[PDB]
Design an enzyme around this catalytic site. Sequence first.
Site, mmCIF file in Angstrom:
data_model
loop_
_atom_site.group_PDB
_atom_site.id
_atom_site.type_symbol
_atom_site.label_atom_id
_atom_site.label_comp_id
_atom_site.label_asym_id
_atom_site.label_seq_id
_atom_site.Cartn_x
_atom_site.Cartn_y
_atom_site.Cartn_z
ATOM 1 N N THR A 1 -1.487 5.281 -7.250
ATOM 2 C CA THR A 1 -0.879 4.366 -6.277
ATOM 3 C C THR A 1 -1.470 4.604 -4.887
ATOM 4 O O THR A 1 -2.116 5.624 -4.649
ATOM 5 C CB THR A 1 0.659 4.517 -6.201
ATOM 6 O OG1 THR A 1 1.001 5.721 -5.503
ATOM 7 C CG2 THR A 1 1.294 4.538 -7.595
ATOM 8 N N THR A 2 -1.240 3.665 -3.972
ATOM 9 C CA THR A 2 -1.847 3.732 -2.643
ATOM 10 C C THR A 2 -1.078 4.678 -1.717
ATOM 11 O O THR A 2 0.154 4.668 -1.684
ATOM 12 C CB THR A 2 -1.945 2.338 -1.989
ATOM 13 O OG1 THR A 2 -2.469 1.396 -2.935
ATOM 14 C CG2 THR A 2 -2.856 2.376 -0.761
#
Lengths: 241, 231, 244, 111, 195, 240, 250, 235, 243
Positions: free
Chosen positions: I30-31
């Site tokens: 995920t970012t």
Amino acid sequence: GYDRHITIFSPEGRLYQVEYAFKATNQTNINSLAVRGKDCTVVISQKKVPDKLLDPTTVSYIFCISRTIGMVVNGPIPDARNAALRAKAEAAEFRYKYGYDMPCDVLAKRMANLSQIYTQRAYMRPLGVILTFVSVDEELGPSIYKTDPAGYYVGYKATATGPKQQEITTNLENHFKKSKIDHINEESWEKVVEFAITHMIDALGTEFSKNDLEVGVATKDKFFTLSAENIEERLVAIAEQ
Amino acid sequence: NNYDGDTVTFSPTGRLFQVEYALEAIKQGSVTVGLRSNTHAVLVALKRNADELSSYQKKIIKCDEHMGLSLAGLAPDARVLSNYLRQQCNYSSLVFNRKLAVERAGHLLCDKAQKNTQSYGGRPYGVGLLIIGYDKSGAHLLEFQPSGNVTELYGTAIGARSQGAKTYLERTLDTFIKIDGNPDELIKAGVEAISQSLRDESLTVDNLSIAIVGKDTPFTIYDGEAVAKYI
Amino acid sequence: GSRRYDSRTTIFSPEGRLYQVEYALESISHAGTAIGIMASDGIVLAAERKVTSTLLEQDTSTEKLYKLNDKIAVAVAGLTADAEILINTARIHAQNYLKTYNEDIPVEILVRRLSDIKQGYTQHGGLRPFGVSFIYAGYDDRYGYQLYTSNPSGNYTGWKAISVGANTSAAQTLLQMDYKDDMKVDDAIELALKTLSKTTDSSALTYDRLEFATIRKGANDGEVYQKIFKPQEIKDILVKTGIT
Amino acid sequence: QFNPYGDNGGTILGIAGEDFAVLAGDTRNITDYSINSRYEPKVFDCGDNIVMSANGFAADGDALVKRFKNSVKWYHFDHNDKKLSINSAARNIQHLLYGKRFFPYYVHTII
Amino acid sequence: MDIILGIRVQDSVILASSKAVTRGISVLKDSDDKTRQLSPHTLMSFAGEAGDTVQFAEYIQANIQLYSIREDYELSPQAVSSFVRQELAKSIRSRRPYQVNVLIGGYDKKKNKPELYQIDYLGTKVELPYGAHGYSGFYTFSLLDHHYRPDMTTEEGLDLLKLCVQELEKRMPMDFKGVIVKIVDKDGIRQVDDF
Amino acid sequence: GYDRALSIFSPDGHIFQVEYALEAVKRGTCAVGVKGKNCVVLGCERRSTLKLQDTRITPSKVSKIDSHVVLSFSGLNADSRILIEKARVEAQSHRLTLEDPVTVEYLTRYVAGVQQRYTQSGGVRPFGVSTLIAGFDPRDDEPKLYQTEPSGIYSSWSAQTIGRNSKTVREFLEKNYDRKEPPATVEECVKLTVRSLLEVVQTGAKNIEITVVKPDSDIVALSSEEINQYVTQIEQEKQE
Amino acid sequence: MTDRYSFSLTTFSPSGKLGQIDYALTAVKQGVTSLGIKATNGVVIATEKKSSSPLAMSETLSKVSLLTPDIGAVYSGMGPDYRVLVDKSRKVAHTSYKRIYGEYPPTKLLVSEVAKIMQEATQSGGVRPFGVSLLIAGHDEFNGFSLYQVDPSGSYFPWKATAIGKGSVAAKTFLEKRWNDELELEDAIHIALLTLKESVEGEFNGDTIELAIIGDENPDLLGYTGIPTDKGPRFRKLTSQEINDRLEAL
Amino acid sequence: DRGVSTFSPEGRLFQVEYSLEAIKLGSTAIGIATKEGVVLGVEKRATSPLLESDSIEKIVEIDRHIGCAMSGLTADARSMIEHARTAAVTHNLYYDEDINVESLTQSVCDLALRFGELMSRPFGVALLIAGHDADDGYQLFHAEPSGTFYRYNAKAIGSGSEGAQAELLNEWHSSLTLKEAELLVLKILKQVMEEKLDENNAQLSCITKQDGFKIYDNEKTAELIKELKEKEAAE
Amino acid sequence: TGYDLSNSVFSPDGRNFQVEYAVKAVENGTTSIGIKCNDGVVFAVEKLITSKLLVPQKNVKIQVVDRHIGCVYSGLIPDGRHLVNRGREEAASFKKLYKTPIPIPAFADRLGQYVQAHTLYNSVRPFGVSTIFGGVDKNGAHLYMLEPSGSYWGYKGAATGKGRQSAKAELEKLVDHHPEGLSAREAVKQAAKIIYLAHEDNKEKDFELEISWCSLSETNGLHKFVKGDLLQEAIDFAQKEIN
Ligand SMILES: [Cl-]
């Protein structure tokens, strides 16, 4: 063919892992150069900061190993910093054990010996780096000594490292054929820095702004790196002649 | 394929196959469910036998007076990990006179599992765990995967056909989270949850295993005639 | 991990043989021949140097024949560097026994321990075996004169006459033919030189390609003398038997 | 020189009846001629209907009680919640004490 | 422990060793045999610290018996004595040294000669015609200096030994409850029952 | 330290390094044990591709572990020395702590345990040796014969053989040994042992070794002539 | 972590060869030529200084190294391997000899210790053999002058004269024609320079050639006076100027 | 090759699965639990008639209240038994009581997964552990090299196991007498064995609260064999 | 070939393929981002809500080292926790010997050398995380990003994970539009916007936003999580910008 995966001999007596570590050396696409004056030793290296999000002040391949010794690295930064921390620790211990500052050539030999071990011992890979050590040694004077992943080391009148190293090397050879001497016959380090940048410009065929370069200078009792404005001051002086 | 010989090797797409194969052992395991309200946390487990002459493999293990877990996968690996939790809970009590937070218990399991995924010679743990507890911040439910990933949840399920119970609990979320001060109802919800994972077999008296911990209830396990109430 | 590069030096073939031991013996079969012959009044050690160059210093040289103590010597066939490791161990072992019991070590005890070290490298540790076969020549007051051989497997046996290294098959047949039990040292010297002369891969046997030694009671009364032959003495003994 | 032992005073007493047992102890804790506490209990319920006191050097007394209480906990963990009988507790406490034979717990123990 | 004596004559070595084991103000035993047979023609007597003595003796016995089985051969008395000396010489610089004094009587079958070695706990070895450990020597050495001849028979040796025991029973402070006497010769080791 | 698991399970459930160690035993010279009514006899083949041997000093095939127990073997000679040494040391250690020599069963159980350990320890290969261990328990006159093998299993035998062509000599012993009536004397037991080796050996010259163990540490090795008399006698009864 | 390579990397092949040792000798064959000649009153060891760049200072790279005051070494093969071997060799002359006997080891024994170190790189866990052949020249009171060759296997041989590396085959043949047992040290230096010229291609002067002798004691190189028994090192490195003086009367 | 502790793509340990194949090659062992005791029986299976069968030891005492039968690579069981005996005696030293049968079994099973790159490989033997304690009465456990153990009312292991287990499924009930169990083990062993069952190639044993663990004489088993043959002919 | 089967082996290019394979595990995560500001640093991360059954606010991903450093990472979450545990050990031993809390560049090299060490041997696996971290020391604010190879640099802004390119583009605009500097409270808001904008590359599952910060004026130089009113204000600012 597992003889290409670890540091054992191939049928032709070669060590491929050492050879491939030499190719990792150019992975950064950066060229470095070192020359000697009467009183000083100047090392310069290209500085390429591609990402706009990077803090440019933290991007460096020149290291202050001790008060007197500087080192520029050609190769990936993780291996570069690994070599730098060991060099700092080795130079600090030498001083504590033997009561005097570690000479540039002795640190070079020691780091070269460590590199040799990785070419003989299987569990340790070579570091994909070439280390150029610079100082003004209290006995030998201005000094340039260079280490590679094979564990080879030697002293230089001047030297260059990187993808376009041969162009810079011959350029320097041709100057010393002309001058007939072992060094840059100049009083101030400022002009030896200027010589270094001038002959890098000629050999590479590119122009540099203040942020395209990185400069380390070794004088008696100290090695220091230059700021962007110190280099800019130096770039102006070259242009006005 | 060429990258599944050991845990120390990454595949070209960045996967760890030995860890994924360990995850697969959990999927073959018998279904177990976990759920909680604000006052209690409940484990429900379906036990598995070898045949009609054998006992039913115990799925639930007590870790402390306020904590315990249920298992799905390699049972000896659950014994190693539960024993580690028992020690960590114990250390906290003896040294700090402090009941180990269920959250810290999760962090400790994560880090123990991780070390077995980065070194040569070792192997990942081959078991999944559902940890329930009641501590200074109320009731808790955790899900442990041997990849190292630990996750806090209102409810969940692991094992074969766990997706049925996991969907049910996802629907029932707003109901069972407010079953406060009523143990028998929270269990009923968990027993109905695990029923969504049954095929050809139904819950019998030497088949069902229930555990509960909460505000005024030590971690206690029910087997045999003590679960007949819930069939 | 490192499993990938492990040769597994200490395993069995499907036939129940030890790969590395077999291959070490194959290595030894290319080394210069060495012969031991046991007579009733002494022992002869004879060995052929590996293809010599004219600029080799012949007198200050040792390659085949080594002294373990005053009563025991060895002839070497195989890697010399491997042999010196083992020779130093054997020399120390002899002194340990002398220090412990105040008596010179019985030959078999020394041979057994050296053979036991070799055995270990074939069962545990994952290391390559020593590529060496020894001929042991020695004397003690229990069995008198004794010849033994050991090889990379760590197996040892006793002999009246024996050869190691190159052309052992031909050398053994020749020794089996002309050996008899009542033989004397000077007869054994001749047999040893005659056998090497016929089995050699060289054109002609000369003094500079040989090492020679005798273990006699030919000192003065009831005591044993080791004679490692000098170059000129080998030149003379080669003329005395009419080989050159 | 550092002396690792001290004396915290107090006294304890155990009597057994036909279907009961008592374990009594005073609540005073001392060093030299001073009172540290007028109420510091040294008789403890250790679970499984076992009461225990280790009287003498309180630091050793507390350490021992702490280790035995922990021993009862692990006995349950390892042997399916089985009750630790008083005779089994006694034998276990012997090993706790003798394990420090050459650096003893400075206490008289009663259960 | 306490009294151990040894006499080497023409054809044999004779060892005499006291029978008492005393602890405190009690004689706990009056028939103790302070000796071990190391090999068929080698006998060792011992005196010193309680526990240490028998432990060392049996340890040496096990080692010599192990050697015998390995080589199918009996070590010479000289060789055995040198092994025992070295073990004690090691011991004296250990964390806890063996406090044991020994006499080794053996018949060398290769030489056809009796041999007697005196070794103390420090590892001090000497070959002697006659030997003693502890306070016994203070009476027996001078006595034997006078009456001993190198060509005596086993019977003469036993009479010479009776003279030593008699002197010790007259002048020594403690009751050592007599001695067990053993003879080492070409035929091995045997015990005299009536002394 | 070298750690490699060399003895491991294969898909079919076999441990190949243990099974290949058995092949080394099958290559070794034949060894046979036969127990009588009051004795055990150990017979051993010696190959004759080796003339010019010195039999005074060459390692004998039957070894004394203690004065009352003997050990013979089939397989790698160097390997057997390690087993014999350990057995001899345990023999003396047992006498030291128990104050009684080893039983033949105990000595065998120890040797077998050592062999088993080398089948599930890292960095080692199994012993390429099977042993016959024979003797008499202290103060006992009942004959004892045991057999061990590389896996670590051991068992008692009325008569047994190991090594090359052992299946041929086992066949012989299986029809020529009566459990109801074991060879009543020393002579009978030596003969049945020599007969069984003559099925496989070649010349009964310097090819057969015979060692006889009787109760109370009574062990003696027969000489060439003594054995040759058994060879001569058996052949004359055969021409019939 | 930790060295999991506890097993041998050099093993026997079915034919009997030790692969890694053979391949190490192949590395030595590729190496620049070095040679040694033994005279009646001294020994000379020589080699070409192959410069890696004309910007490199080849004086800072020494191919001929002092081991003891009476022993020197030169090599053919891999430089880095040689450098660490010289470090180890210098130390072992002290630890296993000088610190015990109060004097420097005789040539044959120091050679023996270096050979041991190289043998162990052939058998120990997780290492390759050294990729060098050494030529060790030295003097000692009871053996006089001697010259030894040490190979990657750990084997060593005494020589009257020999060469190793690139053009060793031709150089050995040249030395056989010229060597006699009456050669004086100056005659041996002359033959060394002649033999080296055949294998050297480019510049042939005192800056491209490295040469040292084992000869008479040098009291002027001792650094102190007052002890009659200490008379100075027999090892001496010839200067760049001393080489050029002899290259005129060539 | 590959690591010793490697998982297959189906989530199982290669070496553990392969050791289970070794156990299928082993000789048959059967156990039946009653309220009057637990019976343990094994097939001896001598490889040759010259081998003295009474030296084959596949039923073994752990303590007075715990016995054990084995199947597979039986040499592997020696250190397992040694550990079991020490565990049992040690618990009695520390607690002045008998160790629970389940606790003993769990202790033995703790050794099982202690292999890798600890021992070099898993055990190649399965164990049937039978005993009595005051808390849970008569118990029978099947201990595997996986580290897992199940309690059984009855269980067969070895080459004839799947056929013998199917037979045990039909025959076992919660009211079997000890004598009924003895005969049942003999009957089912005779069915799956290769050679004809007698007192020399099969062995019986039991554990009772009163008399503890006992291996039966060859004379006692022979009479139970005769009693069994007579009862099968009697309908 | 086979050069990619073992860590620490150089390919003929001079590359360590196993590290490059660890980078693939990071790109899958995920970012997460970092924004350097006037007197501090701000960290934010995307938490994918896999199910309704996840307890909100209760699976915290940002981690504190010492009392002044914050760490966030993308990729194999357990690997990131291992790195932080080491980071905490390094920081504790620095404070033990030298008294002063560990400077951020000093701390950066500690993690760097440790991660680099896991590229030196075939018996260990490289880290499956890129880690964004930083704080405030005696020389002001510092932001760093560390990769599986051991490579790290100082950053004005940093981004890693599945939405790294989207986030990088958004970061570059802030650097161009604010040459003088961004305020701590502004950077918190911007972090929320960028995580929401970077969520477009992971838009199947909706997510939970998590922010933290260290500021000389706003948090007194200590690491604190952004909660309650300041978090909801930052969420709303982000919601307004996507529409
Ligand atoms: Cl160094």
